[PDB]
Design a protein around this ligand. Structure first.
Ligand code: HEM
Ligand code: HEM
Ligand SMILES: C=NCc1cncc(OCc2ccc3ccc(N)nc3c2)c1
Ligand SMILES: C=NCc1cncc(OCc2ccc3ccc(N)nc3c2)c1
Ligand SMILES: C[C@H](O)[C@H](O)[C@H]1CNc2nc(N)[nH]c(=O)c2N1
Ligand SMILES: C[C@H](O)[C@H](O)[C@H]1CNc2nc(N)[nH]c(=O)c2N1
Ligand SMILES: [Cl-]
Ligand SMILES: [Cl-]
Lengths: 362, 362
């Protein structure tokens, strides 16, 4: 019956994928070979064309993503050939390098061997390949609280963080047949960081804020035609709000709004002064300004929303249903200033897609 | 069967209402009289206590409302005795006066006779008792575009607006047995308006912006225990964002953000400058400052969210399920700065409640 779910998903994917690539006449024969392959082996292997397009379809189907306009230009790196942790490590190093591209970020996905019997070949522990550590001890909070549990896990494995507010977490992943994951410290030369300054508030640098250049989500599962690629790290460029309105602003993150209000010279005493709102705007202006100044790719929420409007228009022209999660698509600042706020979206799940999966820690 | 829906709703309402008022032992007898009344008359008449509490329950059940903490302090005016348009007019005039309360706004509802056979005794055309007219002709747009259709309707009835950007629409309602609605010009002495100034940007007054003091929604239907009060205008005080981030900001409303950016001395050329976001903050600061300065009640979105958190806490303590519409509860500026953004809400509809109903114009 496991050979039935896989067979059904495969038929749906191959038909759709080959339609879009204009290879509709080759569906019948390809479906034949797959049918035999599932019978004989219990699974099937995607061609590079299928895998590449499947990854692109998956991004296109990500309801929560505002940046889906450029789904078809995704850079897909096929690494189903890896067998050693050294190979996984170097593939992850390479992903960071090519995606970063000296600041001109290339949306990229590196695809590792898929689950077999639901048995993972490679199991990545990082939420993102580049992320800051977090510590909580004796009322003392350091770094990114979102990373507290992974950090403690890494420190259980012999790693020790310097306990700055911006410790780079090591890459940590487990190979099939190993009981523990291994960890590799990130070469700093691969990691671009952006110091946060303000275009006209000189004192903003006193906050000593910074963030990393490329968000590379590495703990989600890519599903393509019944095949579960549990290890397939992917990246885009940041939307400024992710950093300015969430990462550095949330009380359960870096919680910097009070300090921003201070350096911009406004009181943080009264709700009616809207000091949090003002601090959010200046901080988000600072983030955008800082990334542009260092020549690292970034998009503001207005421009991103305009691009998403075009994605909507493109979907209609192509005859494809549009799906989306309104609650995630709206930016966390001035959402009513975007068209997204003023329309509704069908939150139906279409495959191929990227999914949450259980963590091996916590 | 119409006597069945009514009977079922009545049983559910009376039981619940009398539980909450601690009059549980009187349910059986009250349900008896109602049962006979429905048999004999085809409907039933609420006691003043039931009507008052039903209106309060309805507010408490309004999923989209962030101000529900004060549901139990609602001022309920029972006007089921009205029979003439002069009486309706004076009741509406009175509502404006008492709710305004010289600026110290009292949340108030005036309840008119309910539908009979679904036949309306009184039919209010206004969306709000106080609202600005809107005009669209020859590429010339004046006033509030949201009011374009009602304004044209009023001008079909012999009314003529001065075509300022802030023409007060007349009260317009239709009595049962009349073919046309009547209209009465609002006495200016009853209407408080607030000129919009900025606490430290003196040039802000050049925009000549203003808004009315009290939002009195007058086109929704109150449903209590099977009884349809189609005419029951109600009001609270404004949350600043309604005016600053929507009414004066929406492109399909007053569309003032470009002009705000000008008077606050920032460029409106680049999305990356976040000029819309900055303009929104200053405009919303101006609104709050202006209402406080004139001694007209208003609440900022942070304070309102804190109050709503208490409503959530109060609901749990009372053993009542909480319902809400996340998409409407989140404020249109800095929503992620409120707790509302970071939790989910069950959007189930509980009666008593306030409902949309079809308009007699358009
Ligand atoms: C090219 C630049 C991109 C931008 C600006 C962008 C923007 C965003 C943003 C702002 C979010 C919300 C993140 C959050 O609230 O935590 C998001 C979610 C998401 N994006 Fe994108 N994105 C981009 C590229 C991509 C790529 C390349 C993929 C994968 C192929 C992708 C897949 C997703 C997914 C799966 C989510 C939802 C994750 C979740 O459910 O938690 N996006 N995107
Ligand atoms: C006391 C001050 C109050 C504040 C600050 C407040 C705040 C709000 C706000 C901001 C909205 C959203 C409006 C929009 O987006 O168009 C809302 C919706 C609503 N409020 Fe309140 N409210 C208050 C009192 C009341 C009262 C007295 C009632 C009725 C008894 C009420 C019932 C509702 C209803 C029914 C809606 C939704 C209307 C719709 O679905 O379009 N609220 N409230
Ligand atoms: C832990 N935060 C929730 C979470 C969980 N699991 C995956 C997540 O991904 C968010 C996400 C995913 C893809 C992105 C692509 C580009 C971008 N700028 N941000 C992006 C953000 C977020
Ligand atoms: C036409 N705009 C949509 C709409 C339709 N029908 C009713 C509406 O009511 C919004 C509403 C309702 C009650 C309120 C009470 C207080 C307040 N400050 N705003 C309030 C706003 C809104
Ligand atoms: C599409 C969406 O339902 C619609 O634009 C809503 C979004 N949330 C809102 N929330 C409030 N308070 N008021 C509104 O008018 C809207 N508009
Ligand atoms: C409760 C709600 O689902 C949750 O807080 C969501 C709201 N919308 C969001 N939207 C984005 N883009 N990112 C988030 O983390 C969240 N949080
Ligand atoms: Cl992030
Ligand atoms: Cl309004």
């Amino acid at each position: 019956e496991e050979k039935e779910i896989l067979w059904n998903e495969a038929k749906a994917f191959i038909a759709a994928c080959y339609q879009e690539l204009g290879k509709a006449a080759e569906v019948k024969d390809r479906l034949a070979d797959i049918k035999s392959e599932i019978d004989l082996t219990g699974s099937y292997v995607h061609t590079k064309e299928e895998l590449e397009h499947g990854a692109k379809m998956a991004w296109r189907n990500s309801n929560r993503c505002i940046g889906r306009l450029f789904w078809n230009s995704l850079n897909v790196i096929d690494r189903r050939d890896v067998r050693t942790k050294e190979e996984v490590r170097d593939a992850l190093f390479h992903h960071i390098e090519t995606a970063t591209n000296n600041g001109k970020i290339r949306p990229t996905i590196t695809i590792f061997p898929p689950e077999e019997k639901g048995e993972k070949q490679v199991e990545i522990w990082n939420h993102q390949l580049i992320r800051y550590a977090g510590y909580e001890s004796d009322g003392e909070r350091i770094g990114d609280p979102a990373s507290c549990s992974l950090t403690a896990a890494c420190e259980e494995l012999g790693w020790r963080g310097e306990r700055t507010d911006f410790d780079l977490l090591p890459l940590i992943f487990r190979m099939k047949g190993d009981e523990q994951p291994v960890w590799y410290e990130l070469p700093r030369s691969l990691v671009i960081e952006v110091p946060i300054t303000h275009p006209d508030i000189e004192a903003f640098s006193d906050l000593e804020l910074k963030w990393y250049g490329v968000p590379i989500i590495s703990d989600m599962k890519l599903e393509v035609g019944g095949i579960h690629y549990n290890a397939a790290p992917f990246n885009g460029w940041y939307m400024g709000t992710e950093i300015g309105a969430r990462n550095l602003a949330d009380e359960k993150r870096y919680d910097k709004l009070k300090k921003v209000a201070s350096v911009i010279g406004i009181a943080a005493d009264y709700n009616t002064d809207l000091w949090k709102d003002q601090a959010l705007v200046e901080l988000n202006k600072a983030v955008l300004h800082s990334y542009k100044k260092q020549g690292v790719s970034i998009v503001d929420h207005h421009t991103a929303a305009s691009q998403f409007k075009r994605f909507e228009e493109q979907a209609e022209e192509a005859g494809r249903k549009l799906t989306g999660d309104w609650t995630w698509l709206i930016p966390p600042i001035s959402p009513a200033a975007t068209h997204i706020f003023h329309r509704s979206y069908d939150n139906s799940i279409v495959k191929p897609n990227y999914f949450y999966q259980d963590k091996p820690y916590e």
